[PDB]
């Protein structure tokens, strides 16, 4: 008893499977031409634009729920292109065709399949190959925009900030990772975890372009976590020899002290401790 | 003509020929292209001269007045030039020494000559 939900969703996920066993496992001058390879990898480019219109525009209600019970499911004893077989083809598509491994990153998010085995190879979680940084920085602009939409799941907030620190800051002129940070400023407990990461990565945040992008992201954070941004503005980042990076961390540390005293004197003293306040002023004299 | 007077040591006549290159590209370029690379060379080298010779407000033109408020062009090299107009107004001997170490690959060796003569006339 096959649903009409079930008939039309096995036809569009096993036609992604025909185009990817060729481009990997066919010779480039033997079986195909090169004019015939301009248009064979370009039919996989407009068939992954048809699958992210059905899952996003919401007019196609029945087709979205059918794929989620299939990518979670194994193949029928090996009679289908199962979802762990289809994803070995795409990581050897990383290097020859890096514009079409950014379209396969946005499908796996959309089905509720956030599986941390595949998401670490594409982001390299702990000269270079020139054709992977389009995909490594391209799958981390697309993995934030999935976190920003449904931010109620805190399991995905604490992964991407602790691991990817030097990449999360250095993208901050981008419209999907500009929106990931403002919700962290909205969230009480999610703002405190962002600041533990920079103290481990102060050794790389010293070049003059990487430090201008921290102050625009440490600009406004939560008022319950303004006591940990004032021990980072004094101990680590203020001793830079750049005299407009010593001048712009004078605008941001004087502004934490002023919103705190018009606030409650009860919650701020437990925030900035009386034993921790005496450590700061011995560094300055 | 600006590579001659810095061999001829005409550092005050060198401010006259750098404000004439920038007054045409706002009439002709606004920048295009060929005129977009003439304006990168003329706002990195009018900043290394006004600290070398620091003009009085009588002989400081309304064109020289505009560029020094912005600081007190690539994002790598735009950030290290706001920081060098601050130090010579603070007379900071430790600030100026670590920037020539970190602005030597950025400039070319015509712009590398104007940064050498500031660090001596402030130290």
From Swiss-Prot, chain A:
<comment type="similarity">
    <text>Belongs to the huntingtin family.</text>
</comment>
<protein>
    <recommendedName>
        <fullName>Huntingtin</fullName>
    </recommendedName>
</protein>
<comment type="subunit">
    <text>Interacts with PFN1. Interacts through its N-terminus with PRPF40A. Interacts with PQBP1. Interacts with SETD2. Interacts with SH3GLB1. Interacts with SYVN. Interacts with TPR; the interaction is inhibited by forms of Huntingtin with expanded polyglutamine stretch. Interacts with ZDHHC13 (via ANK repeats). Interacts with ZDHHC17 (via ANK repeats). Interacts with F8A1/F8A2/F8A3. Found in a complex with F8A1/F8A2/F8A3, HTT and RAB5A; mediates the recruitment of HTT by RAB5A.</text>
</comment>
UniProtKB/Swiss-Prot annotation, chain B:
<comment type="subunit">
    <text>Interacts with HTT (via C-terminus). Interacts with RAB5A. Found in a complex with F8A1/F8A2/F8A3, HTT and RAB5A; mediates the recruitment of HTT by RAB5A onto early endosomes.</text>
</comment>
<comment type="function">
    <text>RAB5A effector molecule that is involved in vesicular trafficking of early endosomes. Mediates the recruitment of HTT by RAB5A onto early endosomes. The HTT-F8A1/F8A2/F8A3-RAB5A complex stimulates early endosomal interaction with actin filaments and inhibits interaction with microtubules, leading to the reduction of endosome motility.</text>
</comment>
<protein>
    <recommendedName>
        <fullName>40-kDa huntingtin-associated protein</fullName>
    </recommendedName>
</protein>
């Amino acid at each position: 008893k096959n649903l009409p939900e079930e008939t039309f969703s096995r036809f569009l996920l096993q036609l992604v499977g025909i185009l990817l066993e060729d481009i990997v496992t066919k010779q480039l001058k033997v079986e195909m031409s090169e004019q015939q390879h301009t248009f064979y990898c370009q039919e996989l480019g407009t068939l992954l634009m048809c699958l992210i219109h059905i899952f996003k525009s919401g007019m196609f209600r029945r087709i979205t729920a059918a794929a989620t019970r299939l990518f979670r499911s194994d193949g029928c004893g090996g009679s289908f292109y199962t979802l762990d077989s289809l994803n070995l083809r795409a990581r050897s598509m990383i290097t020859t065709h890096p514009a079409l491994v950014l379209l396969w990153c946005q499908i796996l998010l959309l089905v509720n399949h956030t599986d941390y085995r595949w998401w670490a190879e594409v982001q390299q979680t702990p000269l270079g190959m020139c054709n992977r940084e389009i995909v490594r920085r391209g799958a981390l602009i697309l993995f934030c925009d999935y976190v920003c939409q449904n931010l109620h799941d805190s399991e995905h907030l604490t992964w991407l900030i602790v691991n990817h620190i030097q990449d999360l800051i250095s993208l901050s002129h981008e419209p999907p990772v500009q929106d990931f940070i403002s919700a962290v400023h909205r969230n009480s407990a999610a703002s405190g975890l962002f600041i533990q990461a920079i103290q481990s990565r102060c050794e790389n945040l010293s070049t003059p372009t990487m430090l201008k992008k921290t102050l625009q992201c440490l600009e406004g954070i939560h008022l319950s976590q303004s006591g940990a941004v004032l021990t980072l503005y004094v101990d680590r980042l203020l001793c830079t020899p750049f005299r407009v990076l010593a001048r712009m961390v004078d605008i941001l540390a004087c502004r934490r002290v002023e919103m705190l005293l018009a606030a409650n004197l009860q919650s701020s003293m437990a925030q900035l401790p009386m034993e921790e306040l005496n450590r700061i002023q011995e560094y300055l004299q | 003509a600006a590579s001659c007077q810095l061999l001829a040591r005409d550092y005050t006549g060198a401010l006259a020929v750098f404000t004439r290159m920038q007054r045409l590209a706002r009439e002709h370029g606004s920048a295009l292209g060929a005129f977009s690379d003439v304006l990168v060379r003329c706002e990195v080298s009018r900043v290394l001269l006004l600290l070398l010779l620091q003009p009085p407000p009588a002989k400081l033109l309304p064109e020289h007045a505009q560029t020094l408020e912005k600081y007190s062009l690539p994002e790598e090299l735009f950030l290290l030039l706001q920081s060098l107009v601050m130090a010579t107004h603070e007379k900071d001997t430790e600030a100026i020494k670590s920037l020539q170490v970190e602005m030597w690959p950025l400039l070319t060796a015509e712009q590398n000559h104007l940064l050498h003569l500031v660090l001596q006339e402030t130290i």
